[PDB]
Design a protein around this motif. Structure first.
Motif, PDB file in Angstrom:
ATOM      1  N   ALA A  80     -16.030  11.383 -29.791  1.00  0.00           N
ATOM      2  CA  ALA A  80     -15.257  12.363 -29.792  1.00  0.00           C
ATOM      3  C   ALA A  80     -14.318  12.874 -30.902  1.00  0.00           C
ATOM      4  CB  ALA A  80     -14.697  12.963 -29.282  1.00  0.00           C
ATOM      5  N   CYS A  81     -13.206  11.385 -30.834  1.00  0.00           N
ATOM      6  CA  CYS A  81     -12.282  11.354 -31.052  1.00  0.00           C
ATOM      7  C   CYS A  81     -12.299  11.236 -32.650  1.00  0.00           C
ATOM      8  CB  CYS A  81     -11.335   9.840 -30.788  1.00  0.00           C
ATOM      9  SG  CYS A  81      -9.485   9.927 -30.838  1.00  0.00           S
ATOM     10  N   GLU A  82     -12.718  10.333 -32.962  1.00  0.00           N
ATOM     11  CA  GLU A  82     -13.146  10.146 -34.490  1.00  0.00           C
ATOM     12  C   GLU A  82     -13.643  11.229 -35.215  1.00  0.00           C
ATOM     13  OE1 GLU A  82     -16.177   7.129 -35.155  1.00  0.00           O
ATOM     14  OE2 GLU A  82     -14.748   5.277 -33.720  1.00  0.00           O
ATOM     15  N   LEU A  83     -14.966  11.779 -34.575  1.00  0.00           N
ATOM     16  CA  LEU A  83     -15.071  12.951 -35.414  1.00  0.00           C
ATOM     17  C   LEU A  83     -14.373  14.109 -35.336  1.00  0.00           C
ATOM     18  CD1 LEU A  83     -18.565  14.527 -35.833  1.00  0.00           C
ATOM     19  CD2 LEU A  83     -17.712  15.222 -33.871  1.00  0.00           C
ATOM     20  N   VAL A  84     -13.400  14.309 -34.704  1.00  0.00           N
ATOM     21  CA  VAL A  84     -12.330  15.828 -34.955  1.00  0.00           C
ATOM     22  C   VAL A  84     -11.321  14.753 -36.495  1.00  0.00           C
ATOM     23  CG1 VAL A  84     -12.997  16.455 -32.835  1.00  0.00           C
ATOM     24  CG2 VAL A  84     -11.151  15.200 -33.463  1.00  0.00           C
ATOM     25  N   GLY A  85     -11.231  13.756 -36.338  1.00  0.00           N
ATOM     26  CA  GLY A  85      -9.370  13.488 -36.872  1.00  0.00           C
ATOM     27  C   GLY A  85      -9.647  12.058 -36.458  1.00  0.00           C
ATOM     28  N   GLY A  86      -8.956  12.452 -35.468  1.00  0.00           N
ATOM     29  CA  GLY A  86      -7.961  10.768 -34.605  1.00  0.00           C
ATOM     30  C   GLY A  86      -8.821   9.647 -35.383  1.00  0.00           C
ATOM     31  N   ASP A  87      -7.888   8.264 -34.680  1.00  0.00           N
ATOM     32  CA  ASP A  87      -8.733   7.191 -34.621  1.00  0.00           C
ATOM     33  C   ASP A  87      -9.386   6.722 -33.396  1.00  0.00           C
ATOM     34  OD1 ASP A  87      -7.176   4.495 -34.386  1.00  0.00           O
ATOM     35  OD2 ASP A  87      -5.486   5.929 -34.246  1.00  0.00           O
TER      36      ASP A  87
END
Ligand code: IPE
Ligand code: DST
Ligand code: MG
Ligand code: MG
Ligand code: MG
Ligand code: MG
Lengths: 259, 295, 259, 279
Positions: free
Chosen positions: A51-58
């Protein structure tokens, strides 16, 4: 499982081993270490990184949270398989293996849950601005998902499942509580730590809710097969809908998890 | 002039009133009934008072500390609920009523214990007002460290795993008491000191003070376990007698044990000299009470 | 106080009797009229008219809601007292008498509940512009309080009470659901229909919630005595405290049943 | 129209979806489990279809009418749960599955039924979007009237009270049918039509269409039982019963002459299906 998911899962395993190092008192850390990895792997955890990766973050932004989710789940798994003298918990066929006695499992469970919050309070990097407001928000999601109105209501109501005389509706509810909320929490926390906006967090949350629920039914299918693909199609449908709006190299992977 | 009996009576009323509001009956009913049955049955509230007094001492107020105060009492409670279980000390009386598992079953007692543990973190995290977010996070980490495998739980596991230990070195008996009992009291004094805006040095001094009364609390526990009855204590007293358990009344006998508590109190109060005597009066009082309580 | 509360039960009663005319087919309206009135009155309705006047409205502006609350309450009362074949619902020691057979009582309760909503929709005055929104809101309030989440839940958990073997915590909870929800609803609707601001409505809703739990807890004292007075005062304390901000007679007359 | 069956099937589907979302399992679990047991058991969803079709007929959209469609199916469902009870018709089965009180007990069957009845008002009141407040209150007014002492419940009392005096005449048998069946269809078509913003004239024609098909259904149903107590054939004979059915069908269709032909088609198609069912 799929390559992507197994690779995410392996990073959580690595992160957990590097975080729990057997040291004296070994009588304390051996059981802590063993029981962490003896609990089944849970997607509510890899889902947090995804979920993190998908919205932006690393993914590194969500590791601590992913580890905490696994640990809270690990603690609950240990306690639900606990040898209970008084026959309070419908002697479940499970009969899983036990390296340690009941007392050490009980207590280790109790030590694993705080470890989850520790990594979270200590993953706070001086070079991160909004670090504390998101960590704090995530601690709240985690302690709620692992609390009395979350995963605990699921374990409690699960004791009332009488093998082939309990409805599909009731079973879906227990999986919603027992696995759905943790998955919903994992996708949301990841979403939060990534930096999404309320609207996305809820979408990912709703996705986790449905997927964890579907996953619980899968592990319940091997138990009493009454499970029609009507129940599964239902949840699969509900899950993908929430994902409408995310496109890209992961937003098809996130989709694969359910497809 | 300091009226300690008065101060505690109201602090505890205030703490009991907030514990009842924070954990209400709601579905699933049995889990919640089980949480309230043990949480509101009736402890002395030493930890929540210690938390509140350390916060007030460094300049803050009760309202900012109350949720953490409740949280330390939540975790304290579940730790007794789990300690009483048949796979643990297997007791039948706690706080004057039948132990939680005997009234709800072992399943609910474990689950409700777990519920209290998780909810203490939820509550401190979500309900604390009057503290910057980084300060709350920090307090949650202190709490976590003080109740885990380097705190409460570590003390408790070495405890059941060292119950055959007849070659019990004092270094081993201190490891147990520091961890299973002093660790939680330190955390209680630390959460308050940090939430009240205390400077690192004041936090460090109160941590030291807290380690003192924390050890004193267990020595005193072991002496009551041996000089008081179950009706008196409110819990099953005398099992530590029989077992190969590592209590102080073992390695030095009640007498050399009392003198020891005496040195500890003094030592703790000596740490309080860092503060103005008028402001430290409550913690001085809570300390003598820890030494002189009858239960 | 004394005669104010009576003129109130009487106005609600004259409005009901004027609304439910026995007529053809009497087979239908005979029972409908009888059962509405054979049902013990409920403070939830009284509370509705009082809160409406308390905030400044005219008693009529709340009469339809007040009668709807009695009707919803009457239906539940008829239904909770149905002789049943299977031993579902424990046998009420204080058994009510039945002038009609089970079938007719069951069906009648089904006709009484919608009659309350009918009275509410039908009370909209086309020459009064604030009428629709306040009435809409009130229908949502009553349907929710008499629904699966409110009163129904208390009715259902009520059956788990063992007479000498049930904690006071469980009981207060059954009372908050069985009586409290409805009383809270009554005061809230009375304030809504009266023109009050959100602040006054919530305060009034809170008071009703505590009042009903408290009053239902006495209905119970009759039965299982473990009737601590530590709960009576914990509640009126929380109740009488919600009035804070509001002072006078009614603003402290509400503090007349909490006696 | 083309593919009437496919049309009823798309409707039953979007309605079932919406029912599932409206009534989730939650605490207390037995109450909610009992509500879904009967509500989601699958059926033709004719009532929801009427509501939706009527709304669309006058320009509204399915979306606005959905809460109301779910509501009438809710009412319909609890009327069946209550009716199967030991004190009512005492049925142990319905469509091949244990009846609600046999699965969960009489107490839960009664209480769950009550929960579906008040939830119908709540869901309509709180989930309807795209309608002004007065419209939604009017619509709640029509639902109450269609299921109460002058609608469904009246038809259900008078029937249980007439299972004793086997001398029921045409007028008495029509009373029961109009109240026990037509009133709630009338309720469905009226909520749809109103939420859809149709004129008073339009609402009245739709109210007529429903009363005709409501009765049309019981008449036709009596005819079929015969060519396979009081019934249309024992009262006026099959020949006249058939003449009557055709009159009912024709009258129903006459109501629809002034709406757009294409929006009216599903309703006309439903009247004929009711009239010509082989079973
Ligand atoms: C000695 C330990 C570690 C715990 C029992 O503590 P307490 O003596 O504080 O008991 P309660 O007052 O909470 O009931
Ligand atoms: C220190 C913790 C977590 C629990 C109790 S230690 P103990 O069993 O020695 O003492 P008691 O049960 O309080 O009598
Ligand atoms: Mg112990
Ligand atoms: Mg013990
Ligand atoms: Mg019938
Ligand atoms: Mg029947």
């Amino acid at each position: 499982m799929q390559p992507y998911w197994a690779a995410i899962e392996a990073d959580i395993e690595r992160y957990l081993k590097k975080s729990i190092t057997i040291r004296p008192p070994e009588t304390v850390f051996g059981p802590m270490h063993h029981l962490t990895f003896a609990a089944p792997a849970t997607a509510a955890s890899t889902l947090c990184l995804a979920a993190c990766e998908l919205v932006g973050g690393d993914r590194s932004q969500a590791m601590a949270a992913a580890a905490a989710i696994h640990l809270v789940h690990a603690a609950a798994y240990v306690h639900e398989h606990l040898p209970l003298t008084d026959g309070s918990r419908p002697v479940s066929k499970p009969a899983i293996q036990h390296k340690y006695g009941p007392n050490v499992e009980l207590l280790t469970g109790d030590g694993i849950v705080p470890f989850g919050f520790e990594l979270l309070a200590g993953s706070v990097d001086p070079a991160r601005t909004d670090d504390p407001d998101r960590i704090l928000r995530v601690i709240i999601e985690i302690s709620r998902a692992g609390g009395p109105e979350g995963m605990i209501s699921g374990l409690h109501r699960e004791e009332e499942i009488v093998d082939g005389n309990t409805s599909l509706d009731f079973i879906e509810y227990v999986c919603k509580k027992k696995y759905g909320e943790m998955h919903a929490c994992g996708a949301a926390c990841g979403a939060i730590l990534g930096g999404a906006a309320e609207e996305e967090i809820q979408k990912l949350r709703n996705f986790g809710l449905y997927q964890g629920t579907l996953r619980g039914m899968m592990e319940m299918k091997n138990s009493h097969q009454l499970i029609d693909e009507n129940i599964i199609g239902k949840l699969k449908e509900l899950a993908l809908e929430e994902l409408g709006g995310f496109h890209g190299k992961n937003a098809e992977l996130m989709s694969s998890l359910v497809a | 002039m300091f009226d300690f009996d008065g101060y505690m009576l109201r602090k505890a009323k205030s703490v009991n009133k907030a514990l009842e509001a924070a954990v209400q009956m709601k579905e699933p009913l049995k889990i919640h009934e089980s949480m309230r049955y043990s949480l509101l049955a009736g402890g002395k509230r030493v930890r929540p008072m210690l938390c509140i007094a350390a916060c007030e001492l460094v300049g803050g107020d009760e309202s900012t500390a109350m949720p953490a105060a409740c949280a330390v009492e939540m975790i304290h409670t579940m730790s007794l609920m789990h300690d009483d279980l048949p796979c643990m000390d297997n007791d039948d009386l706690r706080r004057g009523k039948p132990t939680n598992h005997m009234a709800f079953g072992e399943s609910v007692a474990v689950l409700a214990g777990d519920a209290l543990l998780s909810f203490a973190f939820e509550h401190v995290a979500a309900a604390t007002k009057g503290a910057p977010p980084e300060r709350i996070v920090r307090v949650l980490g202190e709490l976590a460290v003080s109740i885990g495998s380097e705190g409460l739980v570590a003390g408790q596991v070495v405890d059941v795993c060292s119950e055959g230990m007849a070659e019990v070195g004092l270094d081993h008996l201190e490891f147990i008491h520091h961890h299973k009992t002093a660790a939680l009291l330190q955390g209680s004094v630390v959460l308050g000191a940090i939430l009240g805006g205390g400077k690192e040095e004041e936090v460090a001094k109160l941590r030291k003070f807290a380690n003192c009364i924390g050890l004193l609390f267990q020595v005193v526990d072991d002496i009551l376990d041996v000089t008081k009855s179950s009706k008196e204590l409110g819990k099953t007293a005398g099992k530590d007698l029989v077992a190969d358990k590592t209590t102080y009344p073992k390695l030095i006998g009640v007498e050399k044990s009392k003198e020891f508590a005496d040195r500890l109190n003094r030592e703790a109060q000596e740490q309080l000299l860092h503060f103005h005597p008028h402001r430290a009066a409550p913690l001085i009082a809570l300390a003598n009470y820890i030494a002189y309580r009858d239960n």
